[PDB]
Design a protein around this nucleic acid. Structure first.
Length: 93
DNA sequence: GACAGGATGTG
DNA sequence: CACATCCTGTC
């Protein structure tokens, strides 16, 4: 219902349901996560925001904007792996 | 292709 | 603001 949802909140919600482990999962105990099925998560993000043409190219650009915002960072050298900068703070928020 | 980040546009 | 879209470049 809430269409104001942000990408990081949405990704947090996906990682919270173990039934989504197939496409996105935690890869550390400190906030690192991997987009196992990147195009699949991008598809879900588009449906959520009603942007039918959403894909990883664009979902990843949205994640790149987080770097300076200190919300999410890239885990260098690790394909599709990013990290929530302030974890678990963002969780209990 | 994945990834970085600038340019322009939208609500 | 918070992306969505498109693009130049690197590797």
């Amino acid at each position: 219902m809430d269409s104001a949802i942000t990408l990081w909140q949405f990704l947090l919600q996906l990682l919270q349901k173990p039934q989504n482990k197939h496409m996105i999962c935690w890869t550390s105990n400190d906030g690192q996560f991997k987009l196992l099925q990147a195009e699949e998560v991008a598809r879900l993000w588009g449906i959520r925001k009603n942007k039918p043409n959403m894909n990883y190219d664009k979902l990843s650009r949205a994640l790149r904007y987080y770097y300076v915002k200190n919300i999410i960072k890239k885990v260098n050298g690790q394909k599709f792996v990013y990290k929530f900068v302030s974890y678990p703070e963002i969780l209990n928020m």
